[PDB]
């Protein structure tokens, strides 16, 4: 009797993959000094 909606798994996988890609594409960082 352990059940979950399938939308949970589907949406979690999609969002996790999107976040992983959008962070993995970064190559260099430039941070500007506060005024």
């Amino acid at each position: 009797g352990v059940f979950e909606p399938t939308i949970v798994k589907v949406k979690s996988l999609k969002f996790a993959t999107e976040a992983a890609i959008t962070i993995l594409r970064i190559d260099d960082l430039i941070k500007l000094h506060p005024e």
């Binding site: 594409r25 970064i26 190559d27 260099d28 960082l29 430039i30």
Partner: protein
């Protein structure tokens, strides 16, 4: 030739500094070019 002495050297230094700055910017953005280029943050 024989003469035409150049008694001022400041313009050469200005030109070289300009070249250096321009090449620095070009090398800075060189990576992001092409289908296999990456992003900047």
């Amino acid at each position: 030739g024989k003469g035409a002495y150049q008694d001022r050297d400041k313009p050469a230094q200005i030109r070289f500094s300009n070249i250096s700055a321009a090449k620095a910017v070009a090398d800075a953005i060189r990576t992001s070019l092409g289908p296999k280029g990456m992003d900047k943050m």
